[PDB]
Amino acid sequence: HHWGYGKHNGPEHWHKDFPIAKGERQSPVDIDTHTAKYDPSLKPLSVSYDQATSLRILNNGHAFNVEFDDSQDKAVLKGGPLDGTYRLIQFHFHWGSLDGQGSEHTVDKKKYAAELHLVHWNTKYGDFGKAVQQPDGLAVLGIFLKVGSAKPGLQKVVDVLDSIKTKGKSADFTNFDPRGLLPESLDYWTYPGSLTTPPLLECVTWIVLKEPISVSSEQVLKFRKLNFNGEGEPEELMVDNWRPAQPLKNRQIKASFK
Ligand SMILES: NS(=O)(=O)c1cccs1
Ligand SMILES: NS(=O)(=O)c1cccs1
Ligand SMILES: [Zn+2]
């Protein structure tokens, strides 16, 4: 016990330990596609994951993280709305108990079955732990998942999940290529916001891709077999680990495309 997604420690409770839950730049938000302004001055996003080095995959009791070696400039995000260079540290997903829900961002109130977060930290702050303390410390690239055809490049991730079923298990996870998770287009919306889990730090430039990837019902079924609890504790399925949309307040969502 600590924060979680249940009725007693879920998102509606987070504020009591992390008062910034109710701040002015919280995530996720609903993306009102008609209100987002086209911005012709935005650069194309630059995703260079050519030399990415995955190390490990971890169940942390909230989701699973695939972690990358971020000790050199190997997998970087740049361009788009970003000044400077951000390094890939980890990716994880948020998903639902049913296909009808699971994403954190919504697009005109539409919920996707899941959402991928590729998390990068601003190289000028030297590490992740320092970047999160800064208003432009992180750039998270969000990609929606819908259920239809399998994504072949996600299969290696779904196959290792049996080995990390419960909170705290980890496993070796080398030579995973994150480029196999990206849709065709790099069209995106961008707005300033926060971590979507405690400590909810307001340190993120959110880059949310317009085009979802499609994954198979069998692939997302396997996410749903993971556990929130630790090994030899009562079984709580890891499902519905998403924060709902937070008020937009004084913020504009820009679009890279018309
Ligand atoms: N605010 S909280 O979700 O971190 C919490 C911890 C214990 C009960 S509720
Ligand atoms: N879900 S998220 O991408 O906003 C995040 C939380 C903590 C590190 S990255
Ligand atoms: Zn996330």
Amino acid identity of residue 49, one-letter, is Y
Ligand 1 pocket mutation pick from 5, 14, 15, 16 by most atoms within 8 angstroms of CB: 16
HSE value, Cβ hemisphere, 13 Å, CA-based, for 57: 22
From ligand 3's centre to the CA of 91, what distance in Å? 8
Where does 60-197 show beta strands of DSSP type E? 64-68, 76-79, 86-95, 106-107, 114-122, 138-147, 170-172, 188-193
Pick the closest to residue 102 from 185, 207, 5 (CA basis).
Answer: 5
**Inter-residue contact 220 to 115 (CB < 8 Å):** no
Method by which the coordinates were obtained:
X-ray
Resolution in A: 2.0
The token pair that represents 29 in the structure block: 């938000």
Question: Alpha-carbon distance 82 to 205, whole Å?
Answer: 8
Q: What is the DSSP secondary structure assignment for residue 245, as one 8-state letter?
A: P
Nearest-CA residue for atom 2 of ligand 1 = 3
Question: Alpha-carbon distance 147 to 21, whole Å?
Answer: 31
**Inter-residue contact 80 to 114 (CB < 8 Å):** no
**Inter-residue contact 25 to 194 (CB < 8 Å):** yes
Architecture of the domain defined by 1-258? Roll (3.10)
First vs last Cα of the chain: how many Å apart? 46
Pick the closest to residue 141 from 47, 251, 40 (CA basis).
Answer: 47
**Inter-residue contact 1 to 228 (CB < 8 Å):** no
**How many angstroms separate the Cα of 138 from the Cα of each of 123, 132, 206?**
10, 6, 8
The token pair that represents 81 in the structure block: 């709305």
